[PDB]
Amino acid sequence: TPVLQSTQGHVSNFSIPASFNGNSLATMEAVYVDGGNAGPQDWTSFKEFGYAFSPSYDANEMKLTEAFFREVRDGEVRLTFHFWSGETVNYTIIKNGNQVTGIAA
Amino acid sequence: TPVLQSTQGHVSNFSIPASFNGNSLATMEAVYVDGGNAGPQDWTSFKEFGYAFSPSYDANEMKLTEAFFREVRDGEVRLTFHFWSGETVNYTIIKNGNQVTGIAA
């Protein structure tokens, strides 16, 4: 299982500390706790590899892009990270203007 | 007092081994030994929490972001780390292309 940690950063270069351990990232969903798909492409919970997010395996991070945040309404978003190993992992961001705080489950 | 150690890394994944010893980071200044404010926002010595730097308390580290380094001209920079406890601590980075060496003062 990969493990993620709580963090605090800026929309322009936000990354979550990630221990990938063995795993490789397949995709990520973003939804509001309100209900609603959050992020670019409101028509699916699943966001776009590369453009919205990307795993930096070298640096042990999950990058969330400015493009992703540009289409997130201020508040609380549940992330769900899907790995090829089958398993998933939930994370929580709280966006407040340019400030973002991540919270691990 | 927190204590920092010397290190070597790449601009994209640079972090200083940090013993926080229960202090908490208020802010950080970056200036050249030349004189000059180094880093993003040339108009203040004090850099931006989150975007330019961030303390990883869990991992006992100080992260310096790629964004920070993107706006550092090659050479030597004195860091000054300010904690809420009042006290500060100086560090030294030497940037050379994508290579960076940190030196505890």
Give chain B as a DSSP string.
Answer: --EE--EEEEGGGEEEEEE-TT--EEEEEEEETTSSB-SS-TT-SB--BTTTEEEETTTTEEEE-HHHHHT--SEEEEEEEEETTS-EEEEEEEEETTEEEEEE-
A65 touches chain B (CB under 8 A): no
A57-70 b/e (C-beta count within 10 Å ≥ 16 → b)? eebbbbbbbebbbe
Answer whether B50 sits within 8 Å of A9, measured CB to CB. Answer: yes
Interface probe for B, chosen from A7, A13, A93 (most Cβ of B below 10 Å), is A13
Domain boundary assignment for chain B: 1-105
Residues on chain A touching B56 (C-beta within 8 angstroms): 7, 17
Looking from the CA of A43 toward its CB, the CA atoms found within 13 Å total 0
The resolution in angstroms reads 2.5
Q: Give bridge partners of residue A91 from the DSSP assignment.
A: A79, A104
Contact A37, A28 (CB under 8 A): no
Residues 24-53 of A with CB under 8 A from B: none
**Cα of A61 to nearest chain B Cα, Å:** 10
B42-65 b/e (C-beta count within 10 Å ≥ 16 → b)? eeebbbbbbbbbbbbeeebbbbbb
Question: Starting from the edge strand earliest in sequence, which strands make up the sheet with B61-64, in order?
Answer: B3-4, B14-19, B61-64, B53-56
Nearest CA in chain B to A16: B56
Answer whether B13 sits within 8 Å of A59, measured CB to CB. Answer: yes
The beta-carbon neighbor of A5 closest among B50, B58, B67 is B58
Answer whether B66 sits within 8 Å of A13, measured CB to CB. Answer: yes
Nearest CA in chain A to B53: A9
